[PDB]
Design a protein around this ligand. Sequence first.
Ligand SMILES: CN(C)C[C@@H](c1ccc(O)cc1)C1(O)CCCCC1
Ligand code: NA
Ligand code: NA
Length: 499
Amino acid sequence: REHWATRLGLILAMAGYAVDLGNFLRFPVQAAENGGGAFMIPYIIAFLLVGIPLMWIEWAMGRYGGAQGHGTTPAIFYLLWRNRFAKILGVFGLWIPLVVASYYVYIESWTLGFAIKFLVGLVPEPPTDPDSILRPFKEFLYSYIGVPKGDEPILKPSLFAYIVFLITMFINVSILIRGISKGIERFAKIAMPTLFILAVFLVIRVFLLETPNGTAADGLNFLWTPDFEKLKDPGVWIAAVGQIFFSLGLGFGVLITFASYVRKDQDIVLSGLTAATLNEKASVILGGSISIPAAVAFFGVANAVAIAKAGAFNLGFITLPAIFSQTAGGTFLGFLWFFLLFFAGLTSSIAGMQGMIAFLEDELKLSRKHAVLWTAAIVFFSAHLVMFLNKSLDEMDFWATGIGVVFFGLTELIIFFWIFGADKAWEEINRGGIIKVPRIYYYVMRYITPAFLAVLLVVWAREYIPTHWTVWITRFYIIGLFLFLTFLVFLAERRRNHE
Ligand SMILES: CN(C)C[C@@H](c1ccc(O)cc1)C1(O)CCCCC1
Ligand code: NA
Ligand code: NA
């Protein structure tokens, strides 16, 4: 079985997974709308009661599984719990990241395409007034995506957008086909520093931004000024717990698959805690210092609320490109920005596609080459739904990363720490550990963590159990995908009985 070569590379691959566009866009937006600096209170609390506990558990299940030649949850859940239902629930953790891959790789391709357009200077050049500056870029994006101009829910992405998507897919395949160490790990050792340099450079450049409307200091001010009165809102406490899931990448079955390449007695306690810390530093230090401050510096702290409510996607693909076009050498600033984003996604997308690569290897005994190609073929195919069907993307993201990760996360807890046995599990976590997990965490993992997750489930339920008919197409497809994965798992166990 493949293994990580260096302890360092392991951490950089894991942190590479967790560090994403959410660090630079999603996290800052959430913080600004939920108490600013006061949002750190329920965020840190969720990091300690939910994030860290769940993270160690996924590392634990991963390594425990990897030692027995299985990297995915259909096999692993069966090992912790020998039921038929256990294999079935495990499919979710093979299904979730595949659904995400169907739209993520595509969104990742946008950043690549934008980065190219910005580098060669093929971008709009306005003109005055905010709507007169934003609109040329709002249109720049819509022509790339192919946002419907009529009542039809049909996207018509440009030939360039589609071609970059191909190139992007090809780039993912290139790394993945070289394997865990020589491919993913080797790239993590290059990408993560390159990422850090780009972030710092942009951070410095943003702090020097001075416009008649404001400064970057005003941005860091508006963002970090604590509004404790919002801490009374449960919704803030829910947003924090949800954000932790998103920022760390819990409930996707990726950490599990990665940790299955960790050797049987190698440390997962300190290593995981480290990669988790790298991610959080990248969020609060780098991500919170670029997007929002620049937006406030140019549009004033007066629009700082409106900017935050405009959504993370607008901030990163319309607002920030528009601000750059109005700065000295801003067209190159746009390129660094998108190239920063592109790598941040590319380190995450190779990580998410590894789960399917692992399954085909471990359970269907495919060569790494075949597993990678058939995985790419599936992800490439499904993406056409995201590319051509309007709001298809939103529907996949709702199911896969709304119900999916929070439900499947709780399923990970119960199976490992309740069914498999809390005591056996606690040993499985701490075994070979450079440092040991604090004794108090045994209670958190057993009660507090699943309590929070259950509340997030019911709170999601009541609010979200309550769209155009075309969603049924996306629902039809993702349901079908689950069925198809169920079939492969079925074929996997029929092959094993023969041998
Ligand atoms: C949150 N992280 C770490 C990135 C993940 C993700 C999941 C959902 C989403 O909306 C964006 C990214 C992702 O890496 C999961 C595997 C498939 C690619 C995306
Ligand atoms: Na993150
Ligand atoms: Na990444």
